[PDB]
Amino acid sequence: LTPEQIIAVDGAHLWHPYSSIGREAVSPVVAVAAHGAWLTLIRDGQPIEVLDAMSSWWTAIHGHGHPALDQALTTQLRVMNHVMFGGLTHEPAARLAKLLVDITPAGLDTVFFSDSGSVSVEVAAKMALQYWRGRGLPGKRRLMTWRGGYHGDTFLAMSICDPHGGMHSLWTDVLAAQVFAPQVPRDYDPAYSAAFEAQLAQHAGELAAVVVEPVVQGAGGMRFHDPRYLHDLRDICRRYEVLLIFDEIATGFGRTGALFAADHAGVSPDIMCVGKALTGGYLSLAATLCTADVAHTISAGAAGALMHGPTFMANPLACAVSVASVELLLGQDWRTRITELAAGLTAGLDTARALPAVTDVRVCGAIGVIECDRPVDLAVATPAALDRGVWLRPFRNLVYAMPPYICTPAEITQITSAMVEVARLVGSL
Amino acid sequence: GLTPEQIIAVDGAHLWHPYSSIGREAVSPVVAVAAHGAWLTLIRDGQPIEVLDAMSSWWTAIHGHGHPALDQALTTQLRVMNHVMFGGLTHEPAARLAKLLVDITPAGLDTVFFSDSGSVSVEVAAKMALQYWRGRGLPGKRRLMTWRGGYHGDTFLAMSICDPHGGMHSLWTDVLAAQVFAPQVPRDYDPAYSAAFEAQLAQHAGELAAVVVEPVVQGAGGMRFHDPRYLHDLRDICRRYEVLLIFDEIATGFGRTGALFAADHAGVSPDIMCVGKALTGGYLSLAATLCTADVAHTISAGAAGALMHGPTFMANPLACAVSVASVELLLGQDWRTRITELAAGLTAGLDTARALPAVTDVRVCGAIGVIECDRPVDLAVATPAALDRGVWLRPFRNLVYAMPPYICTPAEITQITSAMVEVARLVGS
């Protein structure tokens, strides 16, 4: 297929994310290669190189086509593509589980592999529900979260998405009815924690778990909050006997400046979800971790088992590339790398603050955000970014980036420069 | 690097397996160290032994493991582009696969939504159905109807249409959506069943978005077969009462039952279809949900204006590329004759089991063979028995069953069936 043929097939037959068939104002761009921090895209019939400022939605932390990851995949492919995890185990699964148990917050000792973040969230909920049934308290059935959140697109995951402003707002009448605390503020305010506790207190006997994105809320608005709130959540959950679940599917593996965002508060949840960057952006894979206490209580219960088991559970190919990706991350001074990225984003985005349509500029590790006073029009933003050699994907009123960790300072500068120019265009027609 | 002994230690301490416990499983997982063609290399008492993958690693490995054409397709794509985000970009693997799938599926299915797993593809199908009727101004049409004995995955909406006993709804009382269940569909065709189905559906039509079933073969709910004419009746009933029809072909697709898709046995097209397990030839997790032009535009024209779903790894280039190769490999051979020979080999090999004391039925459909016993099959006994005979089997409940790779020779099918007969011989003593 030529690029024009791809476009024709795509228009006729392919659903894209959060889209319609045949009613999108701006058509998809054909991507034909990816290498390191760069994509080759087709524009007006010609190949152009642009920076993947989005890391392909958080995934490409080491860039595309990294030699260590490529070879880990081809090495595993030579030996064993996949076997069923029912009654069999294998080296990639064990090596990855060992790595994950070692580097996640203390106490997370068991690992359930699945194929996507949304499924890993459903597994986390299932763990929490089965835990309390194992305790003989089946009334502990509901989840609590704060507003502004996002946890995936399957129907249980949707139930803890922000109900008034979240992307799943139209489904509230058919979703499970969960408990929502107000939006968590950026700056630390003890009164917010006090109110959260008071609200949790009156629902405690029906709550299985609190589920939150720690430090950074992604798809709900790229909002940051003070890590001290996570400390308060841990304390509150401990005292009222409610499990604490951290969704680190976006925040994991160095992105926020710590290995996991939980680490900013030195807090360990009872259950944790990871994904997006787990395989370094090669393949779909996710994992749900829980404490030995949660596992044992589930295993000692009436069920005697966690009733979940995806067909491709612990896929050897995905696990092998994940092992290589994590080892690559840990074998380098990733902390210094991310601090340098954050400095580069901060310095590059600073002039956006003075722009007329810009309401806030904020950076947290290798995440840079320009918040605008109006929704960003992709028809204007997308060519403006491409003209400057950068692939950006704004959403709502946000021009934001999460670059690969391998980006040089010059590349971060090119990215922040494109972001600023997109923001400038927002405020001038 | 890990020895098989170290793998067992890590596994027992840190890894969840499908529908299992931590630290309480009677039969420890067996270490798999390689897979090629129809064969797995497993560790038994410290020794590596090659055994037949009679399960095709849960329906997935239809061309066997490490097939040169599929290995090649993967490595070829890996050199050009591992992954890019599907939000605003498209690519050749996604287009080639979409074009293939719309061409070979039942008539009328011309749009494709890619996701990462079967369970997610089922949730997408449900969401399509519900959003369809919202698009027609009938939001009351929000329940699903199915027959008993079904299985559709492990996420919470998927669980709601699983057989109440199979999916242990006992444990999940009003956690799950309450759906409408018709009685178990019989093996042989009885028009009275369809008439009763219709009468039940008629009572609920104003609140039903869709009927969802596995066509011809019910997999994880009991490996039961039913006459394809029932699907003809469902299509008619759904058309007359304005309820959508969804076929879940995640286990039945790509030739497994003797037709390219099980629906083709009845010559019926559903409004929405799910595929998954064998889509990638068993290399990587991938699934897809297809729908008609009517379904797609009714969704796209509705007030909501977009299908709000979009997995991070949607339409992953590596998974799509190996899928293209797998599908083309299937289509480029006389697959119909291959399956017929496989079916004949299963029939001949399993006939001996009919006369066994513990055996209540023996049945074959395409490349699927089942021995149904009168009591649970003991894994502690069955698994070394099969391994002694060079065959990996994974019995479930009272069923000794197989779905071998399409590449299995007559000699290999003889080996597989003889292991099945002997497992079925040990149960009844």
Ligand SMILES: *Cc1c(COP(=O)(O)O)cnc(C)c1O
């Ligand atoms: C992306 C994401 C998910 C869902 O992951 P998918 O792979 O898209 O199913 C869940 N939670 C958070 C916080 C995420 O960023």
Ligand SMILES: *Cc1c(COP(=O)(O)O)cnc(C)c1O
């Ligand atoms: C296996 C299966 C599913 C679920 O697929 P996963 O990849 O395990 O989520 C759904 N429906 C049917 C009919 C299946 O056989």
Ligand SMILES: O=C(c1ccccc1)C1CCNCC1
């Ligand atoms: O990671 C995401 C993201 C994060 C922040 C802002 C917008 C989308 C996407 C959320 C929707 N599914 C694909 C990934």
Ligand SMILES: O=C(c1ccccc1)C1CCNCC1
């Ligand atoms: O396909 C399956 C199956 C099929 C028939 C009998 C038992 C399990 C499994 C069902 C549970 N998830 C992994 C696949």
